[PDB]
Design a protein around this nucleic acid. Structure first.
Ligand SMILES: [Mg+2]
Lengths: 474, 419
DNA sequence: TGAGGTAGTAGGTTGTATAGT
DNA sequence: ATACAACCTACTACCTCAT
């Protein structure tokens, strides 16, 4: 009968240095870590996209409740929560018209249809951003359903709507929207017309196609928290993070396009204690592996990434971090890590950590309907452990994983450290996701956004963008 | 002397708002008397209220909801402020807190119909500003704000009910430790007897092609009916590598490393499983990855095993608990069992399209909670067991793999009060 | 919340070396 | 020619977002 230790739930700190455990509750109680001058909000949608976007801004000024406001805290009202106005009176609109939608959307190719609406919005955005004397804090892309519907690979507009046959015989519109706006830094928050006005999008039966009455305030939590973060300040910080740690989340994405099936874009994201994050864009190499079904790096690119991270760290924090954890979902090959080793200052500790959500050690509590609460952990070795970032949470009286939770295998693949600290830190890192405002995520933010990030790297490959904070990459 | 800000309220209708008001007020510097904070146990519970509204209550805040004006307890709470409305002889003593977007004039109680509107309807913040800016024009007493008090409350009070409690609780894995492994693993230089073109997964024993030697826990003599002209193989010629070593890492041949050997046991284990379920009373669901094993309708009495219900019904489709076998060697060698939900519109004829199966699996899962998923699994593995303490898997006639039918239990001090 | 998309992982299907004409 | 190497492809359990 093995024994579980437990990890105390990390505390995230909000306004007035007061830290608790639920951002939803921490912001509601005190508000954000750095209160901000009011968000100027700019809109890039249909004339209808505005009224909907105005519907929400008016809507989230007043409180909006979830189905059960224990498992999901209510949303007091933007101004109450964040102590600043996200006003609907104050909108900076760049219109798009159905004529523009119809003209560019109807192309036979998805991609030529996709890439071009994307270029439409950017010009509409970039023209407003670059040319404008007036200043908008976040650009909100309010996507008519017609766009979301057809602007992905594998969605087939019928052969009886195409006006032009394809000129010849990636393609996700929003990620591309972020990626093309990537070179010139502008916060892009992308919303769907259906979501902001979901009761005005009835189905054939007359009920709404997607019904959100259960969670409507939770939405306001996710959007404003992301809205807030894009507009500048961060909602919160990690409450008790030891000084001078560096979290490096390793991201890759195979480029399927290349004839040689190893072109895989690479990156690293740098999290400290905030989760505002810094995405260090690495360049395109042979990282995918055929034999090993794995991602890896040659030293020379790898040294550049570590140093790009370290140096941008030192420019940010005036020293080299005494501890650097690199997270990825794969093990490290001894060459790639010895590449990191060299770049590193002599006394900084470099720790490689492999967070694999394999399917191991599903733990079923013996008595009761609820599963093990989150923070339970199983330590296999001094090096490898099992962490439950999912499972029952008392301040929510809900399980985070809605079924029986899967812990995450955590192995200090390379470097040495105290697995207990590792577990702790990693439990700490789930808390930093500013965009999806929840109690905690399943993944630490280091690796949380990889797959979404993975698109945005490959989506725009010509650029050589500077290291950037998350809001640009979100 | 009188300092507090007594809040009068309907529970649980206005709890969301009163908890927000009080706490935003308490952290702003005010003293707020609210039923929300205490856990009263006296006959003076009401007198406590009365005593406090009587003497020390500077401001009466009443939630002006529909429920609040119609609530016997809030109407009784209101009774005193008016009674004490005169004593103080200040007009703004009572403050209706209009949080309800839908108050008809008729609901609002007459005393407070008259008074001025603290508009929590349009935005909770503006009115927080209005309630305080009202608290500026008349000098209601304040301390310099310590939000630390604010959430000392929240964290101790509200979260009192439910948090991590120093409790003991055990949890059962879905890992089922292998018990006994064949004393050796041997490798047969089968040579002319082996045919590479042949498939051995109808060889009723776990066999695989590794280099030009033959890998299994079955002793060479075991494949006869489907493998002729092999009485020609020296019993000696074959490597006989000590299994009790391979787990350790004691075995590292530069010809093949242990990492090679550990991977090799698994296909066998999972095959030993896949063959065992050929003959252990369960129809098999095929997913591409590996097979899932769901007992058919009626095999257990009234579709129950050992008091558990491992086959049931959903809509017009029966459900049948199924399991899978991953075998993993590390840290401790175990058989992993992931749980599944197979589906059949009728007792024993499997549904065709997984799209229905996916939607059903999701639909039926909502029903099962941690208690339920565990029992059914445990029982399913209790089900298969071919004796008191374990399962048999048949690598061969004299060689068997024995897996414990009850999973590693983990005991953890620290758990939560079940709601 | 939930209709989605993603990430494991096996393999059978498939694309490359060997080997002999 | 095949005797094999290394892919690629369903299928499913989870987990996320044009949230
Ligand atoms: Mg989100």
């Amino acid at each position: 009968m093995k024994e579980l230790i437990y990890i105390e739930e990390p505390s995230i700190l909000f306004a007035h240095g007061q830290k608790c455990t639920d951002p939803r509750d921490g912001l509601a109680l005190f508000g954000p870590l750095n209160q901000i001058y009011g968000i100027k909000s700019g809109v890039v949608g249909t004339q209808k996209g505005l009224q909907i976007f105005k519907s929400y801004l008016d809507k989230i000024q007043k409180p909006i409740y979830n189905h059960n406001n224990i498992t999901r805290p209510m949303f007091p009202g933007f101004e109450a929560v964040f102590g600043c106005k996200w006003e609907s009176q104050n909108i900076v609109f760049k219109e798009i018209t159905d004529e523009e939608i119809r003209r560019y959307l109807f192309n036979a190719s998805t991609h030529k249809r996709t890439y071009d609406l994307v270029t439409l919005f950017n010009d509409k955005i970039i023209t407003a951003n670059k040319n404008d004397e007036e200043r908008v804090d976040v650009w909100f892309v309010i996507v008519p359903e017609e766009i979301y519907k057809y602007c992905r690979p594998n969605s087939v507009l019928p052969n009886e709507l195409v006006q032009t046959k394809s000129l010849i015989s990636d393609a996700q519109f929003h990620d591309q929207l972020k990626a093309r706006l990537l070179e010139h830094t502008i916060p892009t928050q992308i919303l769907r017309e259906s979501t902001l006005a979901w009761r005005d999008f009835k189905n054939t039966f007359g009920a709404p196609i997607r019904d959100f009455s259960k969670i409507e305030g939770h939405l306001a939590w996710t959007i404003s928290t992301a809205a807030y973060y894009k507009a500048g300040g961060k909602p919160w910080k990690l409450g008790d993070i030891r000084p001078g740690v560096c979290y490096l989340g390793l991201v890759y994405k195979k480029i399927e396009k290349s004839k040689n099936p190893q072109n895989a874009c690479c990156a690293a994201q740098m999290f400290l204690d905030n989760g505002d994050g810094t995405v260090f864009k690495g360049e395109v190499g042979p990282w995918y592996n055929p034999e090993k079904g794995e991602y890896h790096l040659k030293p020379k690119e790898a040294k550049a990434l570590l140093t790009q991270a370290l140096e941008s760290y030192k420019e940010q924090n005036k020293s080299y971090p005494k501890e650097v954890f690199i997270h990825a979902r794969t093990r490290f090959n001894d060459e790639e890590w010895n590449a990191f080793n060299e770049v590193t200052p002599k006394n900084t500790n470099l720790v490689g950590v492999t967070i694999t959500k394999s399917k191991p050690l599903k733990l079923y509590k013996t008595e009761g309907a609820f599963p093990i609460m989150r923070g339970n952990a199983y330590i296999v070795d001094e090096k490898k452990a099992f962490l439950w970032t999912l499972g029952f949470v008392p301040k929510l009286q809900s399980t985070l994983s809605m079924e029986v939770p899967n812990p995450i295998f955590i192995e200090i693949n390379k470097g040495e450290a105290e697995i207990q600290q590792v577990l702790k830190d990693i439990l700490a890192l789930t808390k930093l996701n500013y965009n999806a405002c929840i109690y905690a995520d399943g993944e630490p933010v280091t690796l949380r956004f990889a797959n979404k990030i993975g698109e945005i790297l490959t989506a725009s490959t010509e650029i050589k963008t500077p290291p950037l904070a998350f809001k640009y990459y979100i | 002397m009188r300092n507090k800000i007594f809040i009068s309220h309907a529970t649980p209708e206005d709890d969301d708002f009163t908890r927000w008001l009080s706490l935003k007020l308490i952290g702003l510097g005010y003293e707020v008397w609210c039923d929300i904070l205490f856990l009263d146990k006296g006959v003076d519970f009401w007198s406590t209220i009365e005593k406090e509204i009587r003497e020390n209550t500077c401001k009466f805040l009443i939630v002006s909801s529909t429920a609040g004006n119609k609530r016997e307890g809030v109407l009784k709470e209101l009774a005193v402020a008016t009674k004490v409305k005169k004593h103080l002889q200040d007009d703004m003593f009572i403050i209706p807190l209009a949080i309800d977007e839908n108050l008809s004039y008729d609901d609002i109680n007459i005393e407070i119909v008259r008074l001025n509107a603290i508009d929590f309807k349009k935005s909770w913040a503006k009115g927080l500003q209005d309630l305080l800016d009202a608290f500026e024009k008349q000098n209601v007493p304040k301390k310099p704000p310590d939000h630390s008090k604010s959430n000392l409350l929240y964290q101790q009070i509200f979260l009192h009910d439910k948090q991590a409690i120093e409790k003991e609780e055990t949890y059962d894995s879905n890992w089922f430790p292998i018990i006994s492994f064949p004393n050796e693993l041997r490798f047969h230089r089968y040579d002319w007897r082996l045919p590479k073109q042949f498939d051995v997964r109808t060889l009723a024993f776990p066999a695989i092609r590794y280099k030009e030697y033959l890998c299994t826990f079955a002793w060479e003599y075991d494949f006869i009916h489907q493998l002729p002209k092999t009485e020609t193989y020296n019993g000696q010629e074959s490597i006989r590598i000590s299994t009790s070593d391979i787990l350790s890492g004691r075995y590292d041949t530069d010809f093949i490393r242990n990492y090679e050997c550990q991977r090799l046991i698994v296909q066998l284990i999972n095959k030993a499983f896949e063959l065992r379920m050929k003959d252990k009373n369960v129809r098999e669901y095929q997913m591409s990855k590996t097979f899932a094993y769901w007992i058919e309708k009626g095999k257990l009495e009234k579709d129950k095993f050992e008091k558990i219900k491992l086959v049931g019904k959903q809509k017009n489709k029966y459900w049948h608990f199924g399991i899978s076998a991953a075998g993993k060697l590390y840290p401790s060698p175990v058989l992993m069992v992931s749980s599944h939900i197979i589906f059949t519109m009728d007792g024993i004829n499997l549904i065709k399209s997984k799209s229905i199966q996916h939607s059903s699996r999701r639909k039926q899962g909502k029903n099962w909670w941690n208690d339920k998923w565990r029992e059914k699994l445990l029982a399913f593995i209790r089900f298969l067991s071919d004796d008191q303490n374990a399962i048999y898997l048949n690598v061969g006639s004299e060689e068997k793999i024995l897996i414990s039918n009850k999973p590693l239990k983990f005991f953890g001090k620290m758990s939560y009060v079940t709601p």
